[PDB]
Design a protein around this ligand. Structure first.
Ligand SMILES: O=P(O)(O)OC[C@H]1O[C@H](OP(=O)(O)OP(=O)(O)O)[C@H](O)[C@@H]1O
Ligand SMILES: O=P(O)(O)OC[C@H]1O[C@H](OP(=O)(O)OP(=O)(O)O)[C@H](O)[C@@H]1O
Ligand SMILES: O=C(O)c1ccccc1Cc1ccccc1
Ligand SMILES: O=C(O)c1ccccc1Cc1ccccc1
Ligand SMILES: O=C(O)c1ccccc1Cc1ccccc1
Ligand SMILES: [Mg+2]
Ligand SMILES: [Mg+2]
Ligand SMILES: [Mg+2]
Ligand SMILES: [Mg+2]
Lengths: 346, 346
């Protein structure tokens, strides 16, 4: 294997041979690839049209190098709620708020996240401004999970060897296949998730990766471009279950949600976004709450999918009940307070 | 303009807006572009499908930054004989030998060239092994042209600001749009040329660039893969005249040439390739001579094409007569000896 061989194949517009994507990603992760090689690979792979086998190879290599959580500290039914980012909107941190509510409903959550790349505040930025410790290592994330019901795996802490790819990602600024890897490389390897993808023609490939892993996942793209289930219009859902994918259109109005306008979901810096989380968890009614509940419900449906029994329309109704209730009872607000406290008691 | 804007447009598979390619090449030529951005641009441009406008912009920027020859030192009808390289075949130096014969026929030759990038011995390597000064500056190239009838512009000597792009080209190893630039950026800007292209899919774009400039050029690709007019089979020629491109297939059997096998054109290191130059210039008959006479005749046909009155078959017959006579009379052999002396004598 070599860069000339692998890059030549992608520029010739051919799928890679088995193991070639893995070889390249491993070269990148061990500090053996030049920035020019990283960049050419990321770009060539994107314009060829990456396959699920290829992206799955990249994610596998990352996960090989990642710091794992201690043996037996992650429940079999843990869920993630996370997206690619890069939708270019300023939204409040919808995946993060949704994650808190899901954990409050009693579904164990191990969230993978990161600071903003192009938006004003990312999930990690907002959690830090809420006073949550984003910087915890594996042992402490396990304890957070067990003690609070939610853990946060901060991407740079668990994937230090991604530094070179990350620098290339920043320098080129254009989204590539690398922008898919975050939701695919949660170091705790939870088996279910609500997974947002900003790139309409890469979502199916993401779903394919999860299918191969036999995860129960909803990969979601809002038809307004949000890497979240949206309230402004319909969303496309790639439903992953029993190792297979099917594409659905999802209509929040079908459940009773008023249509919102994207400016109603608008964000600010980390201080503003933190105040939006507090408002939502404090019971403020309106568009932010609606989108949070929808997205929490979606994650609860992915969790339910870890069973044969799981049935689409009933799963949603129950997910929506549970998400609403976790906020209404104050369970979500109290969980956030307990999470903040946990991090202060070292 | 920005890298995110330009790279995004290319990865969306869209042609650039006018001036975007020029902006990017200029960033690259002024040391303002990171290796990652250079590589991402070269790759995305190649996979999109570069246009003649875009490639012409790259070449125009390179020519803007190149060392020029002094005013009024390059005759109106100077010719180049040069290819992309990158054919992955190990040939004797056909363009270089052709160039010497063409000069000896009395057509002024200002050759752009470079050391090998992936073959054993490139034009510049072989010229160096023959005792020719390859790295003369603008003023001495002009004097060489006036006194010997041929000058050689060494690419690193005339395009110092391409240094960063060149390092990226070698690091990625795969051919890109950058590989087209050599034959398109001769600093003496001759108006005619026999131009070899190893990349069948890009040769038409090279021809378009020459058409825009109103050059009289034959862009050639041997149907065996050579960036030269081959003697082993037919060649595709994109004939450039009166600012238009005509695609032709050319068969040397039409002029009485015997088919050769590719192994008969096989080269070696610079010493072996230098000895093959002397053997051809000394009158040795065989396949190598045939390939040199054919390519010389091709450069002479491109030269004739600077006149609107030139006709194709008579131009070929005259080109072949002139190329053959230049060897047989000893004029090509003497010209090489004079070139060597010129470099030794200041
Ligand atoms: O700056 P951007 O490239 O637009 O990225 C926006 C955020 O989306 C992703 O996280 P996540 O889905 O966990 O965050 P959320 O709470 O903002 O939805 C990513 O980790 C960023 O934090
Ligand atoms: O290492 P490669 O990428 O295969 O390139 C082989 C040579 O071809 C080009 O020159 P030119 O056409 O002037 O050389 P020639 O005499 O060998 O035909 C290029 O400048 C190299 O010198
Ligand atoms: O540059 C990335 O995509 C990336 C790749 C591998 C690991 C982590 C990230 C950061 C991230 C985490 C979670 C969501 C989005 C982005
Ligand atoms: O290396 C350089 O500094 C350089 C600068 C300007 C022109 C040519 C080259 C050399 C080169 C060798 C092989 C491929 C491409 C380029
Ligand atoms: O090939 C390149 O990267 C290149 C680009 C711009 C200028 C010069 C070269 C080197 C060259 C000169 C002549 C023929 C082939 C190659
Ligand atoms: Mg999100
Ligand atoms: Mg989002
Ligand atoms: Mg050549
Ligand atoms: Mg050649």
């Amino acid at each position: 294997p070599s860069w000339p061989q692998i890059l030549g194949r992608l520029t010739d517009n051919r799928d890679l041979a088995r193991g070639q994507a893995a070889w390249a990603m491993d070269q990148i992760m061990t500090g053996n690839a030049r920035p020019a090689q990283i960049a050419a690979f990321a770009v060539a792979m994107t314009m060829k049209a990456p396959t699920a086998d290829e992206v799955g190879e990249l994610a596998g290599v990352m996960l090989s190098h990642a710091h794992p959580l201690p043996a037996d500290t992650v429940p079999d039914d843990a869920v993630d709620v996370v997206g690619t980012g890069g939708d270019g909107v300023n939204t409040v941190n919808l995946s993060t708020m949704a994650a808190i509510v899901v954990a409050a409903a009693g579904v164990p959550v191990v969230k993978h996240g990161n600071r903003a790349a192009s938006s004003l505040s990312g999930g990690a930025d907002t959690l830090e401004a809420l006073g949550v410790r984003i910087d915890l290592g594996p042992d402490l994330v396990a304890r957070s999970l067990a003690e609070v019901g939610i853990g946060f795996c901060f991407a740079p802490r668990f994937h230090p060897s991604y530094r070179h790819a990350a620098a290339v990602r920043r320098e080129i600024g254009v989204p590539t296949v690398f922008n898919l890897l975050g939701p695919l490389t949660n170091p705790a390897r939870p088996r279910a998730g609500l997974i947002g993808c900003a790139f309409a023609d890469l979502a199916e490939v993401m779903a394919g990766v999860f299918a191969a892993r036999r995860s129960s996942v909803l990969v979601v793209h809002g038809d307004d471009g949000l890497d979240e289930l949206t309230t402004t219009t319909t969303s496309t859902i790639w439903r992953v279950a029993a190792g297979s994918v099917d594409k659905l259109t999802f209509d929040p109005a079908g459940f009773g949600f008023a249509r919102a306008q994207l400016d109603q979901l608008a964000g600010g810096d980390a201080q503003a976004n933190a105040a939006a989380v507090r408002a939502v968890l404090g019971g403020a009614r309106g568009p932010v709450r609606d989108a949070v509940v929808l997205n929490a419900a979606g994650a609860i449906v992915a969790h339910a999918g870890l069973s044969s029994r799981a049935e689409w329309l009933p799963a949603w109704e129950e997910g929506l009940r549970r998400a609403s209730a976790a906020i209404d009872t104050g369970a979500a607000e109290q969980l956030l307070a307990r999470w903040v406290r946990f991090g202060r008691q070292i």
